[model samples]
Target chain A: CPLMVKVLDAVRGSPAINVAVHVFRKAADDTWEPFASGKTSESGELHGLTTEEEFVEGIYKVEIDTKSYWKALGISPFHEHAEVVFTANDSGPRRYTIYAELSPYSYSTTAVVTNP
Target chain B: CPLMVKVLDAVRGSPAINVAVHVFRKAADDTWEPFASGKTSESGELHGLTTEEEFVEGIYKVEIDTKSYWKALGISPFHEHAEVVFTANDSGPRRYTIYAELSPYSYSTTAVVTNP
Candidate 1:
């Protein structure tokens, strides 16, 4: 089995963002099942998730609700709401993490920081 | 009257967070009115709001809901719920952006930090 996965928060934060994330996976029969749940850290740890505590073999997906999130603030977002979808293989080690955040409607992010 | 509103994106990141913020102020009659709204850039700029253009004054308040946002992701949050509230002087400058995020159920954030 191949084993290597790296997901970044993909938002505009220096350190990173700490958000609660849920992971879903597909079974051998092609049905999605709950894999694990985690969150980012306050230190801008975009990929900050449980270390090897949540892992499984199967297809995976990620979802984020920006519009609804904005509405929670008693305001509407300037752009239509959005969600991202990706694919992965279950051939990696027993350690991996998926980072997601309220990134702009247009742009990406990483896990490390840079100098001023 | 005064000027200058120093706001920051207090989250778990190295730089900051970028959120679409809407500002409201209380009127002499004590009613909140829309002032301005802006979003942070991709630089993790918690206070990455625009320099100016969305400034006016009145009693102010902020709001953010994690449950609704998480549900958007099709998942329930770990915490029952949370929110942050603060009062400011309308006398300050007319340039400021309110920063809020899923800062862990227990934590705070700042801009500057040292080596890893």
Candidate 2:
């Protein structure tokens, strides 16, 4: 199952274009290990975080760094990073979609099922 | 004192590009009441949320709606709105600067003093 995480601007309701994303899987010892990473395109999405057919049941974290993005826009950041955590299982097709709504004041993330 | 807020893109490191912002000052009854509102310009800012030389010492809220902005960019939103709550005082020069960093996955906001 491929994991896709889409980033959007919470205030503008637009894609958080070209933001960098890093994905990590937790190790048996509870150590966070980085596995995959990418950046959003014009539509503000970082898709196919993993091309593998499935992710094992474990805890994972996604770090979205918007520091450089904020500097480029000449807007100061309250916080430079946004992080999301989720648990994956071998259930169903496992094609997961997570949407992260970000803004300067706050941010929200949720798992979603895209309509076929 | 005027309350000025700036909005920025969390991912692309650019201006949010014309995002709408609505500000409300808290009333005596503890109600989240609406007061002044505006939009971020090309510079990703909504300057002088209140032009009055001073605002009473009270609580305030600012709601940044990025629904239309997100829809225009063809991105799905996890959350449609970003809200900020702050307290004001007539103590200083009465001028305040707040910056909001927004993205699809998360957001952050803070108060700042811009260098003269």
Candidate 3:
């Protein structure tokens, strides 16, 4: 696998579990074509979104269904969703992990790119 | 003013200078109305984005022009921009400081809400 995601709940100071995540790769025509999707596990981590062979160099978008997550917790959030968009595999075949921390009204996302 | 922003450049591991920030408040009709705009200073901080009286209970959006920041450094980024949307003053009057870390292809934003 070449991509992963980890999410934390700032409000509860724990991992955000069962949060839905959707991954999209930008097509040559500039549309965000769907690539992969998953939900966070008990540990707030999701892996195997893509394989090394298929995760080519391109712009990718990762959308976290934050509103649903908050709504499940009986909280109304502000953003429709939380998303991270970035260029991937530009330099070479690298592994990427996106770390996101979420609150009812705010969230933060960071990316860690490393050698495969 | 009750709102502030701090931005850091992850690529350079320093404060991101002159990064433009836009502020908006969701109106009663569910439209986002522009409230304020400014650029980060030498220390990657923007203060006085909104006043205590004007920034009442509402949903607010903060937009960071990460694309222009990376473009200025001769780098091609992925996201068109970075934004954080959240409800404010729901519980009561408070102060908000949005801290953001930025890289060429990634960024993170966190909020610290405190008593007045």
Supply DockQ values for each candidate. Answer: 0.02, 0.09, 0.34
**Alpha-carbon error at A56 in model 2, in Å?**
26
> Which ten residues in a row are the worst by lDDT in model 2 chain A?
A86-95
**Share of the reference A-B contacts seen in candidate 2:** 0.15
Would you list the rank order by TM-score, best first? 3, 2, 1
- Candidate 3 has what TM-score? 0.70
Global CA lDDT computed for model 1: 0.36
Give the C-alpha miss distance for residue B112 in model 3, angstroms.
1.6
What tens-digit string does per-residue lDDT give for candidate 3 at B83-107? Answer: 8877789999888888888876567
Off by over 4 Å in 2: A1-116, B90-93, B113-116
Root mean square deviation (Cα) for candidate 2: 12.2
For candidate 1, write residues A1-116 as lDDT tens digits. Answer: 12122333343344333334455566778765765445434553334332333444344543333334445545543223222223332345333232233433321211121111
Best by lDDT: 3
| By lDDT: ranked, best first | 3, 2, 1
Model 3 lDDT per residue over A18-108, tens place: 9999999999999989999999999998866789889999989889999999999999876668888778888988898888889876777
Question: TM-score of each candidate?
Answer: 0.32, 0.48, 0.70
At residue A88, give the lDDT of candidate 2: 56
